[PDB]
Design a protein around this ligand. Structure first.
Ligand SMILES: N#Cc1c[nH]c2nc(N)[nH]c(=O)c12
Ligand SMILES: [Mg+2]
Ligand SMILES: [Mg+2]
Ligand SMILES: [Zn+2]
Ligand SMILES: [Zn+2]
Lengths: 577, 577
C-alpha cells in the first residue's frame, strides 16, 4: 500500500508512531494546522519552519474558487502553498455539516484531489450532528458507507475513511467495523466538532472509544476538529493519532488566547503564562494596542506554539510512561473535562489490552482517579491469586496488602503515594519463593513450576538477580522493575510447563531462520499470538509446530501482533541457535 | 519605614503585591535568582534584562574573600555586580547549616552589609534542621532571637528576620510572634531546604501555615531556598511572597531540566516540553552535543524561563480568581505534592480568614479536593441557618441541597460540576425572601431584619436588582454574584439592627471628615475593624463613637485593615454627609 504506520512507543491506548505517506515520514501524535486557501493567517512556508510536517486544506473551497482552482490545477497544492510536507485535504463535509448541502459530488472532489497532487484525500462522508434523530444518523451513515465504496474503487492516493453515526455508539461500532474491512489507510472520527465546542468531552470520549473498539488497531485515528491543546492528552490516551486545528487561527482573529488548560480573552490577560517567541518578548498590555493584523498574526503564532508544545509534552509523557499522570493533571482544567477523564477510566477492558506490562516511570498515587488507572486494577487481580498462595501479606499505600513476595515487583515496589512503601527484601531461604511469585504473576497460572528447583543469586544488596539451575541462567530479576527477563534456558522451561498458546507468538516459515539466529520478529511475519500478551511482556517465539525459536520482549499486544503488517512485534533477546 | 509593601490583588491566602525599597519597585510573588559571587553561570546584568528586578547574594562569601571584600567596599555590590535592581544579601547562616559554624559574628556581617550598599540584609539566624531534638530547636531559636535583638539595635538598612522553629509548630508560632513585635520589614521562613529537597511538601505546609498565623499580614514572607517552580502555586496559595533559587543553575550543572511539574534528566529527554528561547530552537539531542559549558548555560536559561513563566501563570491565576484551580492542577505533579495540597486544605480556619467573599470566576468542581476549598466550606456553613429557616431546597451539584433563595447568589448560582445547575428565578412574593436570605447570608445573623419593610423590583430578566423602602434605596442585588450592595440607608439600618462591632471599620479622628463625604478609607487611618470582615464584604465606616460616617467595600480582611499602614482599606461607596 501507499501508507505505512508502525508503533514506536506507547502508554495507555496511546502510541507514538511512525507514519509514511508516499515517501514522506512523520511522527505521531501530530496535529495538522488548518490553512485557509484565501486568508492564510500564517504562510504554509512558515508552518513548515515551525516544524509542522503535515497540514490540511479545503478541497471544496479551492474547487469552488476561480483562482484557487486554476492555481491548484496549474501547480498542484504543493507549489501553490509552497509547502513540501504532507498536505492532507478535506472534502467539504464540514461545509456539508454547517450548511446542510454542498455543490459537488463525492466522485467529483475525489477526482479533483487527484488532479492537484494531494498527499492524503477525503471523500464526502456525511457528518451527522450529535443527538440527531436515529433515522437521520442511519440514513446518512449508509450514504457515507456508499460513498466509501465508490472512493475505494477510484482512489489512486491515500484516503481518509471517516467514522460517523452521531451519538449512537452501536452505529460507531458498525461504521468502524465496516470501514476497517475496506482498503483505506487513515480513519478519522467525524461529527464531534459540535461536542468539542460545547465542552461535552464525555460524549467525545464515548464516541471515540466505541470507534476504537471496532477499528483495526493498525491504522491511524484522526479526530476531526479537535484542535485545542486542552484535549490532546486525553485523546492521545484514548488512541487518537492525528488532530486538525483551525482554532489557532480563528481564535487569533478573535483576540482569543490558547492555553493547555483552556482559552483566555486577550483583554482579560494581565500576564502571558508562556515563554514562546511571542510571549517571551511581548506583553498583553502591548498586544492589545497593536494593529488588528499584527494582533492576529501574533496570537496565531502563540496558539501554534502552545499546540506544538502540548503535543511535545504528551509524547515525552508517553516516552516515560507517565501519560495518565498528565491526563489527570489536564483533567483539572475544567469540570466537563474532569467528567470525561472519570468516564475514560471506566473502560478498563478496552484500556487494559494495550496498557504496558511495565513502564520506565513509577506508579504515582496523585488523586482518587489514579486508583482506577489500568495498571492498578490489573496488578490487583493478578495479585489475588498470588497472595492467597504465598501469604505473608504486607501493607501497601496504594494496594493495601500485597504478599511480601511481589513487593520488589512493579507496580507495587515501583510506586509512591502520600506515605512511603517499605519494600521487603528476601532472605537466603526466601529468594526462590520470590521468583516463583513473580513468575506466577508475570507469566500466569502454573508458571512457577519452571523455577521451583532454582537457586537465586543475591546482589551486594539483598536483591534477587541471576536465577540459575544446575548449569545456566534461567532468568534474571530486573532491578528497574522487579520482573523477570527470560534466558533461552528459562523460555524452554516455561515452554514445556505452560500449554500452547500461552506466551506464544507463532511466526512464518520464512521468519523461522531469523528467530533462530536471534533477529527481532516483525509483525508481518506473525501468523498468530497468545491473546493474553500485553506490550513489553516476556514472549516465547515459536513456529507453527510450537517449536521454540527464540525468546524476547513484545512491543505489541497479542492481537496487534496479528493485525499489524509493519513494525516489530518482538524484540529478541536470544535465539535457540 | 525603609520598605513599603501593599496588596494590589489577591486570591486564597495569596496576593500580588507592590514592594518598594530604596525607591526601587518590584511586584510579588517574585523569585530572586541566587547569585554566587564567585562562579556565575548567568551574569546579573543578563538576569536583569531577562526581567529579574531582585536578586540575592552571599555576603558572608564576599566577606571571607580578599578579592570580593575589596571590590565590594570599593564599589558597593551594585557596581560589583553590574546590577541596578534590588540586591538582597544573605548572612551566611546557610553555610552555618551545611557545616555547623561560620567564622563571622552576627554583628560583623550586619555591618559589612551596611558598608557594601546592600538594599536588604539578613542576620545570622540559625537554620535548625527539620527533625531536630526539641532542646536543640529551642536552644538555637533563642540564639537566633538574641541576634535578632542585636540586629534591631544596630540595624541601619532593611532586614530579613527569619522565622525558625524547626519542625515544631509551637516554636514557629512563637518565633513569628516575637519577630513581628520587633522592627523588621521582611520575614523569611527558614530551615525548610532539607524538606523541599526531600519532596516533603506536607511538612513545609505545616511550617509555613503555623508561621503565617503568627506573622503580621503586612510584611513580605520569603520562603528561603525554594527555587523550583513546583511549589510556587502551592506556596503562594499559603501567602508566600518571595522565593529565591540557586537550583536554576545548580541543576543546569548536572544536566537537570526544570518543569512546572518536576525535574528531568537531559539524557532522558526525547522532546523539550517548552517553547522558551532555548527549547524553542534546540532539540534534546542538539543540546547534548554542545560542550559542557554551553550546555549548562542554555539549561540554566531554560530553568529561569520556566521559573519566570510559572510566576506569570500564578499571578494571572490570582487576577482571575482561579488560583485554587491552578494549585489543584499542580497538585498532580507528585504524590508528596498531592499530600501537601490535601493537608493545606485542612487549615480551613487560616485560609478562610483571607478568602474573599465574592470572586469574578465561577466555582469549578474539578476534583474531590475542590469540595473542600475555602469558598465551599464557608458557603456550606453560612447556609445551614438559611435552609433551616427559608427552606425551599433545590438539588445543587456541589452543596447538594440549598435554599432556592441563595440559588442566585455566589458561589451557588455560578458553579459548574459534571452537570449544570439550573437557576431558580423568584416570583414576586419571593422577591423579598431572597433579599432576606441573602442578607442573612451575606451580612450574617439577623441582618435580614434590616430588610423586612422593603420592596424588591425585578428587571427585564426576572432577577431582583434594587431594594427600596419609603421610596429610598436600601441596597441593590449585584447581578454578577447575587450579593447585596448597600446604599447609605441600607447601612444605617444594618448599623442599628446589628450590634457593634459588626461590619464596622473604625476610623481615625483625622479621617472622619473624608469618610463623611465619600473619600476612601486608608488602612493607616483604621484603628480597629470587625474581625469577621472579609475582602470585598459590605462594610460600615464609622468613628470611635460608632457613628455611621459612610458605606463601602472592604479591600482587606478586618484583621488586615488594622495592621496595614499602606493602601486603601475600604472603597467608600457614599458618605452620610
Ligand atoms: N465534526 C467534524 C468535521 C470537521 N471536518 C470534517 N471533515 C470530514 N470529512 N468529516 C467530518 O466529520 C468533519
Ligand atoms: Mg501480522
Ligand atoms: Mg491601620
Ligand atoms: Zn505564547
Ligand atoms: Zn525551555
Amino acid at each position: 500500500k501507499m501508507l505505512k504506520f508502525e508503533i514506536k512507543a506507547r502508554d495507555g491506548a496511546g502510541r507514538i508512531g511512525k507514519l509514511e505517506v508516499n515517501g514522506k515520514k512523520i511522527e505521531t501524535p501530530a496535529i495538522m494546522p488548518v490553512v485557509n486557501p484565501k486568508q492564510m493567517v500564517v504562510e504554509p512556508k512558515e508552518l513548515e519552519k515551525m516544524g509542522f510536517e503535515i497540514i490540511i486544506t479545503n478541497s471544496y473551497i479551492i474547487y469552488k474558487d476561480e483562482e484557487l482552482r486554476r492555481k491548484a490545477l496549474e501547480l498542484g497544492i504543493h507549489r501553490m502553498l509552497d509547502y513540501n510536507g504532507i498536505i492532507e485535504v478535506d472534502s467539504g463535509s464540514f461545509q456539508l455539516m454547517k450548511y446542510g448541502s454542498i455543490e459537488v459530488s463525492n466522485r467529483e472532489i475525489i477526482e479533483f484531489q487527484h488532479r492537484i497532487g494531494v498527499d492524503i484525500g477525503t471523500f464526502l462522508d456525511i457528518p451527522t450532528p450529535p443527538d440527531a434523530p436515529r433515522e437521520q444518523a442511519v440514513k446518512e451513515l449508509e450514504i457515507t458507507l456508499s460513498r466509501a465504496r465508490e472512493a475505494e474503487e477510484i482512489k489512486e492516493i491515500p484516503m481518509n475513511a471517516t467514522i460517523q453515526g452521531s451519538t449512537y455508539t452501536d452505529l460507531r461500532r458498525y461504521a468502524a467495523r465496516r470501514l476497517s474491512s475496506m482498503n483505506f489507510e487513515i480513519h478519522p472520527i467525524g461529527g464531534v466538532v459540535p461536542l468539542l465546542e460545547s465542552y461535552r468531552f464525555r460524549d467525545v470520549v464515548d464516541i471515540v472509544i466505541s470507534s476504537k473498539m471496532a477499528l483495526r488497531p493498525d491504522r491511524p485515528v484522526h479526530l476531526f476538529g479537535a484542535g485545542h491543546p486542552i484535549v490532546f492528552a486525553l485523546a492521545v490516551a484514548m488512541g487518537v493519532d492525528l488532530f486538525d486545528s483551525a482554532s489557532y487561527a480563528l481564535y487569533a482573529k478573535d483576540d482569543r488566547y490558547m492555553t493547555p488548560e483552556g482559552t483566555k480573552r486577550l483583554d482579560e490577560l494581565d500576564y502571558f503564562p508562556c515563554s514562546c517567541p511571542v510571549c517571551s518578548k511581548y506583553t498583553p498590555q502591548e498586544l492589545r494596542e497593536m494593529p488588528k493584523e499584527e494582533r492576529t498574526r501574533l496570537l496565531a503564532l502563540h496558539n501554534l506554539w502552545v499546540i506544538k508544545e502540548e503535543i511535545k509534552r504528551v509524547k515525552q509523557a508517553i516516552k516515560e510512561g507517565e501519560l495518565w499522570r498528565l491526563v489527570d493533571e489536564r483533567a483539572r482544567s475544567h469540570p466537563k473535562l474532569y467528567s470525561a477523564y472519570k468516564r475514560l477510566l471506566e473502560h478498563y477492558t478496552f484500556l487494559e489490552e494495550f496498557e504496558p506490562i511495565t513502564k520506565k516511570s513509577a506508579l504515582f498515587k496523585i488523586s482518587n482517579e489514579s486508583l482506577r488507572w489500568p495498571v492498578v486494577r490489573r496488578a490487583k487481580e493478578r495479585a489475588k491469586s498470588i497472595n492467597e498462595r504465598f501469604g505473608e501479606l504486607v501493607e501497601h499505600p496504594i494496594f493495601g496488602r500485597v504478599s511480601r513476595y511481589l513487593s520488589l515487583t512493579y507496580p507495587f515496589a515501583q510506586s509512591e503515594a502520600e506515605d512511603d512503601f517499605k519494600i521487603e527484601k528476601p532472605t537466603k531461604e526466601d529468594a526462590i519463593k520470590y521468583v516463583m511469585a513473580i513468575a506466577e504473576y508475570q507469566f500466569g497460572e502454573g508458571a512457577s513450576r519452571a523455577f521451583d528447583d532454582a537457586k537465586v543469586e543475591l546482589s551486594k544488596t539483598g536483591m534477587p538477580r541471576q536465577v540459575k539451575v544446575n548449569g545456566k541462567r534461567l532468568a534474571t530479576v530486573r532491578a528497574d522493575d522487579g520482573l523477570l527477563t527470560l534466558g533461552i534456558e528459562g523460555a524452554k522451561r516455561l515452554h514445556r510447563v505452560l500449554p500452547y498458546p500461552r506466551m506464544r507468538v507463532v511466526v512464518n516459515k520464512e521468519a523461522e531462520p531469523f528467530a533462530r539466529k536471534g533477529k527481532d520478529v516483525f509483525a508481518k511475519f506473525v501468523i498468530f499470538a497468545d491473546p493474553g500478551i500485553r506490550p513489553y511482556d516476556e514472549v516465547l517465539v515459536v513456529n507453527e509446530n510450537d517449536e521454540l525459536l527464540a525468546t524476547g520482549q513484545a512491543l505489541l499486544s497479542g492481537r496487534e501482533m496479528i493485525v499489524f503488517q509493519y513494525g516489530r512485534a518482538v524484540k529478541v533477546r536470544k535465539g535457540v541457535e
